[PDB]
């Protein structure tokens, strides 16, 4: 009963994801093995959702795992929750992206595109009713960004009614850490627009803030802000996997999220996040939980969002709460930020209450932000992207892949259409 | 299963190769016998027989059998599968035409068959690394001759060459403007991404950042050895943001002409100074971007960077990666190009740089190979260019070239593809109009 | 009652069979020395079928070994089971069969053939009720081929209402492993056609890609090769050997699964087969074991299914498991490829279910596919063999053993016969 | 139980006999005295007495003396039975007249009395295995007369010839031509499938692959004893899927004129490459497609291979078999005849090919013995025709032969014959039409 293929693409995706699998290993209390150990039957209660049952009782995941080069899966194999995962899973080519769009969606992707659907099919035939398909990757790769949005647009067509919900690391806006990266963004956002329901847009100076400045952690390793996703993206799927005062799934964070099929592009955020030294002078109150989402250093996209309105919000909870305390703060925000609320949207926010905190945690949030904040997320790519393209460098790497002008004329050309509807519904009265 | 083949070639080429594969046996902790003591991690360049032996991917060729012969008599002997190594009888003798009509024809189809004997025991062969010199003949004439065969063969394999740039003011050679201009081009159309080096810019290096007054090519070549074991860092080895040969063509050849990077890597100190300086991953990096620290003996201040590549490895946090990087966008003295806005790659590896022993360079637990591709290196072509114009004025040297292969149009084919080369530089580094 | 005389014909046929007789010796509990030595007495309530009970009880195999050359019984005899076998079963030339078809059904095997029929004779007066003959063997051999297909015409003259199931290893599509067989298998189906009930066609091919990407051994010997066909083999008489729910026997695998006196061309298939890794990743039920059949990369045939229409299909079930997850399971292949299975049959899955799994295993499969997928199988054979025949080369080697052109016209004729019918039958509606 | 007894003829098939019985006792353990110190797989090439004594089931036949006595006073003396080894007087001396008609006639009756007392006591005899060269006297002549003899006396058995084909450039006779059509018109009615092994193209092998510059026949008659012992693996030894003599001329002969394969063995290494490889079955099968390692001079990718015998022996995996084989067909050098789209045979052995002491080959845990029936030995028999057309144009040397006991005539009889089988390889290699 509504079951989700995590798919993992890229370097990227493959490394916050096997930091997922151990957030929900923990959530559910799976072992190294694959065999529960939990004490509670209310982690067993929907195991089903990611994880397949073998034979000895052992759990393992509901996870595809997909890049072009074989060093990334070496590093998963050999780490630990390693050994869980399916081997048949694993599917990987030798070559690498090359940090390319197009040999990830047309040289070397799409000669691996069949030995994934065929995974990808043969896992959602084993699911009783399917909700839906998650997938990790970035946006300035080439195997996240060619060969994994290559496999949104062959999922989309082979399962429409579908939730496709993107965890998608968007460059950031200081450091560029991929020289072609305008190109290999804006040839994604092409495919986001058409074949996502919901896209989760992360920024890496964001979490590089939140370490910093938040957790007061002054050297963040990448596994420190893979432990900042990885605690996002089980918190947008906690209903589905535990009982709550008020329940939500990926379908009531996707109806109650997206006004218009292309505005679909969200910020995430979390709280509590406390230091280790400044967590014993701090309680944990719903209050405490609101301010802390609600501001702009908390974002864990690097786009400040008194710079644009929020059109809906979801703010999912977990832990023994009460439904006033949380009813009062979420008008509260809605009061005294009531300019950087949409207007025409009365009561733009979506609150679901699950019973569940993560380990060690009292009670816990996670904020999903639907704003025109964004706007400049994408006005910087656009801007980055016609300052390459005007004197056509690094195209030739593009264009020798199969590949013309005009394909990247189209995607500009979406994307300052989608730039033009955040500009629409933020001024709109 | 990612395997890489690598090519040797001149004297120039085998010689940096002896400090190369030294530094990949004690990365891997394989012996010179080819054996280790108690992780398919070699798997890139080390092929393993049925006991614990694991030999190289290599191949060394050297028109002469001076530079091969130390190899085959020296500590790596047992190491070295002995039909890799392979010879002439005599060298191409700065000479172009040697190299590539007269002596190089010689053996081409036997470094081919060997090329392809390791090609077929590659099952996953991601690409070629050439290490040669743009000045002696057979570092020039026979791999523009190599060039061509293995983008026939292979084509869509990507082929990187480690060129030895010729120097300014040092020249070893009186005809290095004419087997350079001669080698590239032939291997414009057909390698993919040459990474540029200079010996006079490493002598910088080892006298002022290494203390040492008197260095010698064994020092030299410990250094680039360094570049290539940061550049297949993250084929080797898992790390937290991984690189692979076709990143490095996509993220820093904007046109298919211009692919002409220059590498620099840091820190390079001694160990009498590896204290007295922390190294965090900001203090690394703008070691690279400083100007004395390239190892191209160019002013990059002179030139807008188009695009880099920051190869961080070792004890490197991703946060301070972003701490680093964000500071010199700011900074007026590193310049990017006006259509590049996103113009940095980078990798972090989990290894540190091990330390050769009888190595110059300390122990340090970070390091970073810039590998920026800047509009810069047009000063060097416009040298090389004039070193070239002075030359062929005269007709000097031409009689050496036309009797072994050779037509005198073909100098006047090499010298307007360079001009038009060299407009390539100032049609890009422009600014944009609107 | 229901005796099985099992027959070894070639080098091919006396590896696959020693390889049967190890799989048969283990799901009956009989020692090196041929003395029951299982605990379960399902094991010998039906002993007599594979079975002679000697003095002492002591079982022998009721296997007539027969080659033309005694390098292959010093293999067997001198090998693990070898003592079990009786001496007077071991009929075997000296000269060899020299690769030929012609000295294997006229020159050397027509010497030998009386030596055989006189202990097929003396083996099948000694059965109470006479199931029929079993067969293995190869077509690109010679004494496969020659002295095999020799053997079946001259067992179908003497018993004509037994069944005459042949374990005929085909030649593989890529490599040719003779360079004669082309020859050899055609004269051989010229002999197939007329005078088996089924036939049961498997490629080296096949066996090579299951061994490697399904089972994971980068390095099969035959020995591993020919555990997947004694797995088939044992497979195929399960039900006739122990109980089951709904029993079968290869009668009721003859009338369900050949329509039409000349179709009886079957395709082999085994199911479970992981690796030693990927075993703990993975759950033992019938619809994993449907799903893993039903594909194109589990047919011990190397021809794609999808190319072509099941007339028939059986599958032979083991194991203690529900009948209402078999039928859901076999109806749910039926609706989701309709177009796969032929329309003018409705219902065409034969299912049989047994009680007893495999050594080792906790239920098991066998399918059995009568597809229209085998004509490209002899539209291959049938342009190698006219490519050769009409430049007549490989010739003289055969006409001067006693025959015509006009034998492989007619061999030749009656493949293309067979072609048309398979053609016709996918095309019929 | 499957007796074969092998011949010897002339001193190239006496001297390879030297290497192959050497080989065979190896094998099997037998001593020089026939003894062996503490399994019945000698019985195909050895006869047992009474005691633990075995001795070979082996005709050495020499007109001339000299050969014979070094076998009869050498390390296996003690070996042989002494009137197995047959001598004459005087040699046929490079004349194919006096080894058929003057000298061959003396002791024919001779050696067909030894051969059916070997038959007698051989309960399973498949065939014979005559060991002769195309270039001497006795080789050519003696030869042509007892494949006629056998041919009445036994006539269903399987004669398998191995013969020494003489070299393009290479000849150590001046009547190598002669001796060569007049043997090839008398054994082509007679012998079932005849393996040609020529000297040039093993001098190469083994100053190549094996690195030795001056190799000895010797040395060479350690290659041909491997052939043979891959050849004859599967009677000796058990193996996965074996093959028999009747099965070689079944695979590899398409028509009764054309039975002239060409031998090739895989790995020819020495002990320094028997590291810095790992020698898998598919490295061993593309070096037997190469060109360079067949041992008959001739260019296997100037004709098509009607039909190949890949026989694999040792450390054998069938499947990657399947996988070395399959790449074959898929390339364009390997080209096939249009009607044979099934153009191999495949046997696997259990048993290594075994080291002898002091032999140049290294302990390997595989090989392959290649016998490839193509289209490009039509090459060789062009050379033979025009080096006998450049001589009996002149009538020379044919005074030599006529005084012995032959006609004039009989020359043109056999030219016309082998004008004859030069248009069959014509006939066979071109493609069909519809
Ligand atoms: N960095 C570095 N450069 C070297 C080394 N050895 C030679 N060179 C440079 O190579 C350039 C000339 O090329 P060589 O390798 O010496 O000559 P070649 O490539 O063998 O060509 P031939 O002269 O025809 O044999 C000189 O300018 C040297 O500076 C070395 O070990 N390290
Ligand atoms: N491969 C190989 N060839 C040999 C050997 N000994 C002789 N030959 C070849 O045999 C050819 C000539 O045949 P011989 O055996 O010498 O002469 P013959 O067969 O005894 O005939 P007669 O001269 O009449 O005695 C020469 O071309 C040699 O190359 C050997 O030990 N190994
Ligand atoms: N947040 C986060 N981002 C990462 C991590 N690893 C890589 N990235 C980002 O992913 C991008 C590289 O894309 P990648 O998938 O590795 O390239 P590809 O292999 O060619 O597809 C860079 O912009 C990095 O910022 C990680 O562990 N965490
Ligand atoms: N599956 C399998 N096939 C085999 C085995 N041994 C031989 N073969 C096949 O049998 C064929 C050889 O026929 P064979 O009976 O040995 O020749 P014969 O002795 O002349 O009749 C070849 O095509 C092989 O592929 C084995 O152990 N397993
Ligand atoms: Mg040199
Ligand atoms: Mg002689």
Redesign the interface.
Known sequence: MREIVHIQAG??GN?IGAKFWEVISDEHGIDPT?SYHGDSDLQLERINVYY?????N?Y?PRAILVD?????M??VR?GPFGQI????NFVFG???????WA?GHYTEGAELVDSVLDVVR?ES??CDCLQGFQLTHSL?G?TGSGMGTLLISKIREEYPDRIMNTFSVV??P?????????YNATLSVHQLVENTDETYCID??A??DI??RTLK?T???????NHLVSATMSGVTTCLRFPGQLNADLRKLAVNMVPFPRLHFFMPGFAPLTSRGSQQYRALTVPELTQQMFDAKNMMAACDPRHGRYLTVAAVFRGRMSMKEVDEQMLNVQNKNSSYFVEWIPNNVKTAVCDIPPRGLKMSATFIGNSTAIQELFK?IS??FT???????????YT?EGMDEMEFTEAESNMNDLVSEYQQYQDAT | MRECISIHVGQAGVQIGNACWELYCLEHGIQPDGQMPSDDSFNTFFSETGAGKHVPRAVFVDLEPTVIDEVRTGTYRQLFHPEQLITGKEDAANNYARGHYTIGKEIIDLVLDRIRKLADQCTGLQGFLVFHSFGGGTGSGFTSLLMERLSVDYGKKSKLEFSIYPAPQVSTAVVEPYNSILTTHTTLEHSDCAFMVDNEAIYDICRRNLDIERPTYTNLNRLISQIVSSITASLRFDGALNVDLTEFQTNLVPYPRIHFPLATYAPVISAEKAYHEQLSVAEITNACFEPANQMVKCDPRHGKYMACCLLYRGDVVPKDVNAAIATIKTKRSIQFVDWCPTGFKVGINYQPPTVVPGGDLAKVQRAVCMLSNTTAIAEAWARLDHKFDLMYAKRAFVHWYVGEGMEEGEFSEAREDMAALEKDYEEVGVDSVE
């Open positions: 370097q990227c490394q694959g397949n049952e073998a034979a000895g052992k393992v072009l080069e074989p060093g990334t070496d590093s050999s995962f399916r081997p048949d030798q070559s690498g992206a090359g940090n390319n040999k043969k035939e084993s300035g080439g460059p950031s200081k450091v560029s850490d991929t020289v072609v990266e305008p890496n100076e979490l590089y370490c910093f952690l050297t963040p390793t990448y596994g420190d802000l910087r801007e980055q300052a390459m393209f005007r004197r056509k460098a690094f195209l030739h790497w020798g």
